[PDB]
Tab-separated table of C-alpha atoms and ligand atoms in Angstrom:
chain	number	residue	atom	x	y	z
K	1	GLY	CA	26.676	-54.429	14.372
K	2	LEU	CA	25.130	-51.652	12.185
K	3	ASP	CA	21.486	-51.302	12.654
K	4	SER	CA	19.282	-52.017	9.595
K	5	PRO	CA	16.959	-49.437	7.925
K	6	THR	CA	13.233	-50.147	8.705
K	7	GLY	CA	9.822	-49.492	7.403
K	8	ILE	CA	10.084	-50.698	3.771
K	9	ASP	CA	7.219	-49.542	1.660
K	10	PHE	CA	6.215	-49.411	-1.932
K	11	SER	CA	4.492	-46.978	-4.155
K	12	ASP	CA	3.708	-45.993	-7.771
K	13	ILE	CA	3.519	-49.573	-8.834
K	14	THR	CA	3.248	-50.290	-12.615
K	15	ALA	CA	3.789	-53.268	-14.898
K	16	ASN	CA	7.484	-52.302	-15.239
K	17	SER	CA	8.471	-50.392	-12.167
K	18	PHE	CA	7.737	-49.385	-8.560
K	19	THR	CA	9.162	-46.903	-6.018
K	20	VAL	CA	10.709	-48.425	-2.805
K	21	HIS	CA	10.965	-46.414	0.418
K	22	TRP	CA	12.671	-46.935	3.750
K	23	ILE	CA	13.571	-45.316	7.123
K	24	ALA	CA	17.237	-44.732	8.065
K	25	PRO	CA	18.673	-46.537	11.120
K	26	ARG	CA	19.307	-44.672	14.365
K	27	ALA	CA	23.061	-44.933	13.585
K	28	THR	CA	25.766	-43.326	11.572
K	29	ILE	CA	25.606	-44.352	7.880
K	30	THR	CA	27.528	-43.695	4.728
K	31	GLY	CA	25.198	-45.061	2.139
K	32	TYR	CA	22.726	-47.845	1.270
K	33	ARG	CA	23.068	-50.836	-1.032
K	34	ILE	CA	19.866	-51.975	-2.633
K	35	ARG	CA	19.379	-55.273	-4.506
K	36	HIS	CA	16.369	-56.644	-6.276
K	37	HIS	CA	15.620	-59.801	-8.200
K	38	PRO	CA	12.551	-61.775	-9.431
K	39	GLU	CA	11.616	-64.229	-6.815
K	40	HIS	CA	13.280	-67.616	-7.351
K	41	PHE	CA	15.885	-66.273	-9.820
K	42	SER	CA	19.022	-68.193	-9.192
K	43	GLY	CA	21.307	-65.592	-10.513
K	44	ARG	CA	22.868	-62.237	-9.599
K	45	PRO	CA	20.435	-59.538	-8.397
K	46	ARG	CA	20.401	-56.086	-9.752
K	47	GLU	CA	22.113	-53.542	-7.487
K	48	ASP	CA	22.080	-49.882	-6.850
K	49	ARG	CA	24.163	-47.893	-4.408
K	50	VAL	CA	22.070	-45.047	-2.967
K	51	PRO	CA	23.236	-41.914	-1.062
K	52	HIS	CA	22.847	-41.804	2.661
K	53	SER	CA	20.643	-38.695	2.348
K	54	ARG	CA	18.086	-40.590	0.312
K	55	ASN	CA	15.090	-42.718	1.504
K	56	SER	CA	13.615	-43.971	-1.654
K	57	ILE	CA	14.480	-45.300	-5.167
K	58	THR	CA	12.417	-46.038	-8.252
K	59	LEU	CA	13.162	-49.395	-9.812
K	60	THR	CA	12.513	-49.566	-13.553
K	61	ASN	CA	12.907	-52.142	-16.300
K	62	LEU	CA	10.960	-54.815	-14.258
K	63	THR	CA	9.050	-57.584	-15.772
K	64	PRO	CA	5.236	-57.555	-15.471
K	65	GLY	CA	3.333	-59.830	-13.212
K	66	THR	CA	6.393	-60.610	-11.162
K	67	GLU	CA	7.054	-60.647	-7.515
K	68	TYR	CA	10.486	-59.103	-6.712
K	69	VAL	CA	12.547	-59.552	-3.567
K	70	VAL	CA	14.061	-56.227	-2.562
K	71	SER	CA	16.873	-56.049	-0.049
K	72	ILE	CA	18.224	-52.711	1.513
K	73	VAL	CA	21.390	-52.694	3.477
K	74	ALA	CA	22.741	-49.756	5.433
K	75	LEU	CA	26.565	-49.213	4.867
K	76	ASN	CA	28.935	-47.500	7.286
K	77	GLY	CA	32.326	-47.564	5.648
K	78	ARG	CA	33.226	-51.249	5.898
K	79	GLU	CA	30.241	-52.256	7.940
K	80	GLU	CA	26.991	-53.567	6.576
K	81	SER	CA	23.655	-53.901	8.321
K	82	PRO	CA	21.557	-57.041	8.011
K	83	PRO	CA	19.124	-56.465	5.144
K	84	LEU	CA	15.768	-54.938	5.303
K	85	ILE	CA	13.661	-57.127	2.922
K	86	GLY	CA	10.414	-56.605	1.134
K	87	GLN	CA	8.437	-58.316	-1.555
K	88	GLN	CA	6.360	-56.390	-4.162
K	89	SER	CA	4.857	-57.502	-7.421
K	90	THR	CA	4.443	-55.442	-10.613
K	91	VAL	CA	1.085	-55.188	-12.390
K	92	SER	CA	0.354	-58.020	-14.929
K	93	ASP	CA	-0.016	-57.145	-18.522
K	94	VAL	CA	-1.467	-60.570	-19.482
K	95	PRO	CA	-5.151	-60.919	-20.332
K	96	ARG	CA	-7.218	-63.210	-18.201
K	97	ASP	CA	-10.207	-65.642	-18.436
K	98	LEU	CA	-10.106	-66.403	-22.092
K	99	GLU	CA	-13.184	-68.273	-23.114
K	100	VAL	CA	-15.376	-69.282	-26.167
K	101	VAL	CA	-18.704	-67.654	-25.457
K	102	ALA	CA	-20.547	-68.931	-28.542
K	103	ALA	CA	-19.987	-71.079	-31.523
K	104	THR	CA	-21.433	-71.849	-34.858
K	105	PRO	CA	-20.237	-74.665	-37.086
K	106	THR	CA	-17.391	-72.436	-38.539
K	107	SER	CA	-17.015	-69.601	-36.118
K	108	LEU	CA	-16.206	-68.974	-32.497
K	109	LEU	CA	-16.813	-65.777	-30.495
K	110	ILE	CA	-14.118	-65.421	-27.808
K	111	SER	CA	-13.889	-63.120	-24.852
K	112	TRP	CA	-11.311	-62.265	-22.194
K	113	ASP	CA	-10.663	-59.643	-19.579
K	114	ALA	CA	-8.213	-56.852	-20.151
K	115	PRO	CA	-5.074	-56.618	-18.011
K	116	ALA	CA	-4.881	-53.638	-15.677
K	117	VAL	CA	-2.566	-51.738	-18.115
K	118	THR	CA	-3.323	-49.559	-21.154
K	119	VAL	CA	-3.605	-51.990	-24.040
K	120	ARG	CA	-2.959	-50.615	-27.573
K	121	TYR	CA	-4.227	-53.771	-29.346
K	122	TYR	CA	-4.711	-57.468	-28.757
K	123	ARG	CA	-3.177	-60.117	-31.021
K	124	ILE	CA	-5.368	-63.061	-31.547
K	125	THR	CA	-3.833	-66.263	-33.050
K	126	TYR	CA	-5.463	-69.600	-33.825
K	127	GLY	CA	-4.657	-72.954	-35.498
K	128	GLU	CA	-5.742	-76.572	-35.567
K	129	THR	CA	-4.384	-78.324	-32.498
K	130	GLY	CA	-1.742	-80.713	-33.910
K	131	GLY	CA	-2.258	-79.758	-37.477
K	132	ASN	CA	0.447	-79.185	-40.138
K	133	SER	CA	-2.088	-76.432	-40.743
K	134	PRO	CA	-1.186	-72.613	-40.873
K	135	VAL	CA	-1.446	-70.655	-37.713
K	136	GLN	CA	-3.418	-67.639	-38.342
K	137	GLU	CA	-3.402	-64.121	-36.758
K	138	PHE	CA	-5.438	-60.850	-36.518
K	139	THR	CA	-5.753	-57.952	-34.160
K	140	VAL	CA	-8.489	-56.129	-32.262
K	141	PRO	CA	-8.299	-52.612	-30.719
K	142	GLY	CA	-7.107	-52.520	-27.278
K	143	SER	CA	-10.399	-51.086	-26.115
K	144	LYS	CA	-12.226	-54.224	-26.913
K	145	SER	CA	-11.815	-57.660	-25.270
K	146	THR	CA	-13.888	-59.839	-27.581
K	147	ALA	CA	-13.340	-61.258	-31.046
K	148	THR	CA	-15.076	-63.426	-33.679
K	149	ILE	CA	-13.010	-66.195	-35.413
K	150	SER	CA	-14.477	-67.201	-38.694
K	151	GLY	CA	-13.789	-69.623	-41.430
K	152	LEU	CA	-13.044	-72.614	-39.188
K	153	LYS	CA	-13.878	-76.364	-39.919
K	154	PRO	CA	-16.562	-78.215	-37.910
K	155	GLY	CA	-15.335	-81.032	-35.666
K	156	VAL	CA	-11.788	-79.864	-35.209
K	157	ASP	CA	-9.611	-78.965	-32.263
K	158	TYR	CA	-8.265	-75.476	-32.247
K	159	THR	CA	-5.784	-73.680	-29.986
K	160	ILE	CA	-6.583	-70.000	-29.567
K	161	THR	CA	-4.161	-67.551	-28.037
K	162	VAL	CA	-4.456	-63.804	-27.066
K	163	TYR	CA	-1.626	-61.327	-26.343
K	164	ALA	CA	-2.048	-57.763	-24.882
K	165	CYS	CA	0.314	-55.424	-26.744
K	166	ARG	CA	1.253	-51.937	-25.606
K	167	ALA	CA	2.926	-49.396	-27.821
K	168	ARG	CA	5.683	-47.605	-25.816
K	169	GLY	CA	9.151	-48.223	-27.418
K	170	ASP	CA	10.916	-49.482	-30.518
K	171	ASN	CA	8.744	-52.559	-30.752
K	172	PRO	CA	5.233	-52.808	-29.446
K	173	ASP	CA	5.620	-54.523	-25.983
K	174	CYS	CA	3.333	-57.629	-26.085
K	175	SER	CA	2.502	-59.647	-23.068
K	176	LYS	CA	3.053	-63.299	-22.550
K	177	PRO	CA	0.090	-65.016	-24.235
K	178	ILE	CA	-2.935	-66.801	-22.694
K	179	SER	CA	-4.228	-69.859	-24.621
K	180	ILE	CA	-7.300	-72.243	-24.645
K	181	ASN	CA	-8.213	-75.264	-26.789
K	182	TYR	CA	-11.674	-75.680	-28.147
K	183	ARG	CA	-13.195	-78.266	-30.493
K	184	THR	CA	-15.675	-76.942	-33.159
X	1	CA	CA1	6.422	-65.252	-3.233
């Protein structure tokens, strides 16, 4: 059988990419086949054919906060090696630890922790839990991870959600949201 590559390693990890490295087998090879998929995904992995002279690839268009399974197979014409497998997560872009830090009868001060990415702005939404009531939205600058919500009703359950939004492409790229409930 054809010996596998060895020494899988990862570098330059971001929310949407990372670089994968490996060491060629002590064998004749004609190329590599690299596959990657989010863990537990039941469908087809993404695939790249890499030249035999190469020992790394940067994988892009990845989803934040996700562990990927990466498989590298050496090829020698018809033959394939068993795969060299590694698991690496991308950085999460989702805020953490959303909480109400203070309350008055009609206002809530909320606070959270920034994700480890460059946030352009946060979007805050809030509405009465279970109300036919309008959901309301506003933003805060990405440099600040607190907000004050005003104009609320006392004695009412509210759902409050925060998104971290980055501004890189055709649309802002906003994280999955984090939510809490709080009764004024
Ligand atoms: Ca896992």
